[PDB]
Design a protein around this ligand. Structure first.
Ligand code: 9GZ
Ligand code: ZN
Length: 197
């Protein structure tokens, strides 16, 4: 009915990481550690790092799913709004209803859960490239937080799960997301609101 959001490093020490992009007016994606919140523009690249202490087995996968953050909306499926689901911006792989896409990975799979109707996107784990210490997934969010008939100004969380080949849980992390026109300004505003409180 509601997916768990409990942080769980698990046996492999799984956790996310984010770049330090700053809060200039021109920034397209920026992460606030104080808020545990990603701010991004519509359909722009959101780099999310995956970190582990030890290598999970071959066949491990990484899934992303959005849920509403407020408890009174958490049973509602997060989906694209009535406008964006019809705007024919498909990449050939993501269903037009899905909020979260993975960019530039032909092995991404998109699930419409047959029991919960929730959407998710899952990719195989791949080792870091030589010279790197982590792997990065590039996500896109395909509706604004404000879209009427969709998120409708309600905050969402993205839950990232590390899963075995059967889909069993190996690790979990999460972050809030706001999809907005000016992520740098909005991050600055919300961090100031937190400081004043
Ligand atoms: O250091 C490593 O060997 C390493 C290895 C993997 C990895 C590679 C292949 C596989 F099948 C399962 C896991 C990995 N990873 C990729 C997505 C989630 C974690 C990471 I981050 C690593 O740092
Ligand atoms: Zn929309």
């Amino acid at each position: 009915s509601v997916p768990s959001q409990k942080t769980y490093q698990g046996s492999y020490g799984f956790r996310l990481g984010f770049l330090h992009s700053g809060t200039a007016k021109s920034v397209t994606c920026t992460y606030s550690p104080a808020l545990n919140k990603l701010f991004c523009q519509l359909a722009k690249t959101c780099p999310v790092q995956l970190w582990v202490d030890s290598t999970p087995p071959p066949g491990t996968r990484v899934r992303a799913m959005a849920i509403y953050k407020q408890s009174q909306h958490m049973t509602e499926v997060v989906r694209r709004c009535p406008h964006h689901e019809r705007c024919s911006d498909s990449d050939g792989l993501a269903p037009p209803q899905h909020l979260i896409r993975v960019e530039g990975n032909l092995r991404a799979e998109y699930l419409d859960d047959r029991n919960t109707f929730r959407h998710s996107v899952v990719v195989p784990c791949e080792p870091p490239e030589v010279g790197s210490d982590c792997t990065t997934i590039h996500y896109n969010y395909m509706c604004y937080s404000s879209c009427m008939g969709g998120m409708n100004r309600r905050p969402i969380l993205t839950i990232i799960t590390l899963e075995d080949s059967s889909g069993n849980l190996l690790g979990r992390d999460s972050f809030e997301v706001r999809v907005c026109a000016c992520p740098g300004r909005d991050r600055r505003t919300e961090e100031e609101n937190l400081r004043k409180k």
